[PDB]
Write a protein that binds this DNA or RNA. Structure first.
Lengths: 50, 48
RNA sequence: CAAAAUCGAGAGGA
C-alpha cells in the first residue's frame, strides 16, 4: 500500500533543452507535478470538512 | 581479350541496351564510428 | 575545449 511515493532522480528524468533555451520537461516530471498538486489539494480539503 | 590480345574461345553476345542510374550511391551509405557522441538518457551511442 | 532536441506520420533499401 503506497504511503511514501518515491521520486526518481534527475538522471532518470532528464530535462532536455531546446535548440534555443525552452527547457521541455519529461512526461514523468509532469506527472509528479500533477501528483503533488492533487496531494496538496486533497490534503487541504480533507483537512477541513468536505 | 584486352589483357592479352588472344581471341576468346566463345562468342560473346553484345549490343546496345538502355540503363538507368539509381539514386543509391555508396557515398551516402559508408559509415564508421569509433567513440563519438552518445544519447543523454542511457549513455549509449546515437543512431544514424 | 567538445559542439547538434524530443514525439508522431510517410516514403524507401536489403
Amino acid at each position: 500500500i503506497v504511503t511514501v511515493l518515491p521520486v526518481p532522480p534527475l538522471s532518470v528524468r532528464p530535462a532536455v533543452v531546446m535548440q534555443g533555451s525552452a527547457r521541455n520537461q519529461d512526461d514523468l516530471t509532469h506527472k509528479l507535478a500533477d501528483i503533488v498538486k492533487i496531494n496538496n489539494q486533497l490534503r487541504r480539503n480533507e483537512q477541513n470538512g468536505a | 581479350n584486352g589483357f592479352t590480345g588472344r581471341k576468346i574461345t566463345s562468342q560473346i553476345f553484345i549490343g546496345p541496351t538502355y540503363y538507368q542510374r539509381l539514386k543509391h550511391m555508396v557515398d551516402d551509405k559508408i559509415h564508421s564510428r569509433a567513440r563519438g557522441p552518445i544519447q543523454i538518457l542511457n549513455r549509449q551511442p546515437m543512431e544514424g
